[PDB]
Amino acid sequence: YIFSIVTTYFPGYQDFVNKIRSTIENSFVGWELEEVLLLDMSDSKIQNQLKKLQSPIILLYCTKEEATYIFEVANSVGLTGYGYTWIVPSLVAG
Amino acid sequence: IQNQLKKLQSPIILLYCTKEEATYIFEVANSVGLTGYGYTWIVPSLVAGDTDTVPSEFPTGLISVSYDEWDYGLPARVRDGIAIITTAASDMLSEHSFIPEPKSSCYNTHEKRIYQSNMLNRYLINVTFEGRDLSFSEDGYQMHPKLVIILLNKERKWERVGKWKDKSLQMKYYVWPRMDDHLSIVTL
Amino acid sequence: IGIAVILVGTSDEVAIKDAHEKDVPRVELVAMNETDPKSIITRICDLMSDRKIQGVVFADDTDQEAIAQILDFISAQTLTPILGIHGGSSMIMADKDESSMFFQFGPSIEQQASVMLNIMEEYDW
Amino acid sequence: KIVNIGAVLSTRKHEQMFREAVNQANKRIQLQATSVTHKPNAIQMALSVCEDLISSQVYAILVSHTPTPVSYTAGFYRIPVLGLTTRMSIYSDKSIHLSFLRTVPPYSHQSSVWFEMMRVYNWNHIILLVSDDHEGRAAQKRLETLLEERERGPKAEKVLQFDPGTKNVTALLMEARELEARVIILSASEDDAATVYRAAAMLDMTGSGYVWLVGEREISGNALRYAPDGIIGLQLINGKNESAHISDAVGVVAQAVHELLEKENITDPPRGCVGNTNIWKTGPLFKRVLMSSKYADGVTGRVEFNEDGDRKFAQYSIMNLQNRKLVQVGIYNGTHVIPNDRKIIWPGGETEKPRGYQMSTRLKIVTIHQEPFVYVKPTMSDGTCKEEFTVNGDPVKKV
Amino acid sequence: GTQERVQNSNKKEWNGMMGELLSGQADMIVAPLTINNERAQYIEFSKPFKY
Ligand SMILES: *[C@@H]1O[C@H](CO)[C@@H](O)[C@H](O)[C@H]1NC(C)=O
Ligand SMILES: *[C@@H]1O[C@H](CO)[C@@H](O)[C@H](O)[C@H]1NC(C)=O
Ligand SMILES: *[C@@H]1O[C@H](CO)[C@@H](O)[C@H](O)[C@H]1NC(C)=O
DSSP per residue, B153-181: -SSS-EEEEEEESSS-EE---S-------
Does the beta carbon of D237 lie inside 6 Å of ligand 3? no
CA distances to A28, C1, C64, D93, D308 from D90, in Å: 70, 38, 22, 6, 10
User: In terms of Cα–Cα distance, which of D269, D272, D273, D303 is closest to D286?
Assistant: D269
- D343 phi/psi in degrees, rounded to 5: -80, 120
| Cα–Cα distance measured from residue C122 to residue B63, given in angstroms and rounded to the nearest whole number | 14
Residue type, C58: F
Is the pair A, D in contact (3+ CB pairs within 8 Å)?
A: no
User: In terms of Cα–Cα distance, which of D106, D117, D101 is closest to D304?
Assistant: D101
Buried b (16+ CB within 10 A) or exposed e, C22-44: eeebebeebebebbbbbbbbebb
Which of the listed residues C33, C36, C42, C43 should we mutate to test ligand 1's pocket, taking the one with most ligand atoms within 8 A of CB? C33
What angle do helix axes D283-290 and D242-260 make, rounded to 10 degrees? 120
Q: Which of C86, C102, C107 sits opposite B74 (nearest CB)?
A: C86
Distance (Å) from CA C33 to ligand 1 centroid: 6
Q: What is the DSSP string of D304-367?
A: ---SS-GGG--EEEEEEE-SSSEEEEEEEETTEEE--SS----SSSTTS---S-----------
Does the beta carbon of C32 lie inside 6 Å of ligand 1? yes
Pair A57, A2: CB distance under 8 Å: yes
Closest ligand to C-alpha of residue C31 is 1
Pair C19, C25: CB distance under 8 Å: yes
Sign of CA dihedral A63, A65, A67, A69: negative
Contact B35 A76 (CB under 8 A): no
User: Which run of H or of E encompasses D17?
Assistant: helix D12-26
| E-assigned strand segments in chain B | 13-14, 41-43, 61-66, 147-152, 158-164, 169-170
Classify burial at D183, counting beta carbons within 10 Å of its beta carbon; exposed 0-12, middle 13-18, buried 19 or more.
buried
Contact C112 B89 (CB under 8 A): no
Pair A34, A66: CB distance under 8 Å: no
CA distances to B123, C89, C120, E47 from E39, in Å: 82, 74, 45, 15
- Alpha helices by DSSP H, listed for B43-96, are 74-94
| Cα–Cα distance measured from residue D131 to residue E3, given in angstroms and rounded to the nearest whole number | 80
| Cα–Cα distance measured from residue D230 to residue D211, given in angstroms and rounded to the nearest whole number | 7
Pair D263, D9: CB distance under 8 Å: no
- A29/E contact by beta carbon, under 8 A: no
Question: Is residue E34 a known part of a binding site?
Answer: yes
User: In terms of Cα–Cα distance, which of D236, D219, D237 is closest to D228?
Assistant: D219
- B106/D contact by beta carbon, under 8 A: yes
Contact C38 D50 (CB under 8 A): yes
Side-chain-side CA neighbours of residue A49 (13 Å): 12
Residue numbers after which chain D breaks, C to N beyond 2.5 angstroms: 28, 65, 151
Contact B102 C105 (CB under 8 A): no
| E-assigned strand segments in chain D | 4-9, 36-37, 58-63, 125-130, 155-161, 183-187, 211-212, 233-236, 315-321, 326-333, 336-338
CA distances to C33, D44, D73, D188, D260 from D280, in Å: 20, 25, 14, 40, 15
Q: What distance lies between CA C107 and its chain's CA centroid?
A: 14
DSSP state for residue A52 in the 8-state scheme: G
* All chains having 3 or more CB pairs closer than 8 angstroms to chain C: B, D
| Cα–Cα distance measured from residue D1 to residue C5, given in angstroms and rounded to the nearest whole number | 45
Classify burial at D48, counting beta carbons within 10 Å of its beta carbon; exposed 0-12, middle 13-18, buried 19 or more.
middle
CA distances to A48, A57, A59, E41 from A2, in Å: 20, 6, 11, 21
| Cα–Cα distance measured from residue E51 to residue E49, given in angstroms and rounded to the nearest whole number | 7
Residue type, D178: E
Side-chain-side CA neighbours of residue C3 (13 Å): 24
Pair D39, D48: CB distance under 8 Å: yes
Pair A3, A55: CB distance under 8 Å: yes
CA distances to A3, A31, B23, C91 from A77, in Å: 18, 27, 18, 37
Q: What is the DSSP string of E1-51?
A: --S---SSS------HHHHHHHTSS-S---S-----TTHHHH---------
Q: Which method resolved this structure?
A: cryo-EM
| Cα–Cα distance measured from residue D322 to residue D326, given in angstroms and rounded to the nearest whole number | 6
Side-chain-side CA neighbours of residue C125 (13 Å): 17
Residue type, C72: D
- C5 phi/psi in degrees, rounded to 5: -130, 140
Question: Is residue E48 a known part of a binding site?
Answer: no
Contact D43 B106 (CB under 8 A): yes
* All chains having 3 or more CB pairs closer than 8 angstroms to chain A: B, E
Ligand 2, atom 2: closest residue by C-alpha: D168
Which atom of ligand 3 is nearest the CA belonging to D239? 14
Does the beta carbon of C80 lie inside 6 Å of ligand 1? no
- Beta strands B169-170; B158-164: pairing state: antiparallel
For chain B, give the number of residues: 188
| Chain E residues touching A25 at Cβ < 8 A | 12
User: Which run of H or of E encompasses C115?
Assistant: helix C109-122
- C102 phi/psi in degrees, rounded to 5: -170, 165
Sign of CA dihedral E1, E6, E7, E10: positive
Q: Nearest-5° angle of CA D246, CA D250, CA D252? A: 120
Distance (Å) from CA C9 to ligand 1 centroid: 8
User: Which run of H or of E encompasses C7?
Assistant: strand C5-8
Question: Is residue C86 a known part of a binding site?
Answer: yes
Q: Nearest-5° angle of CA D355, CA D360, CA D365? A: 155
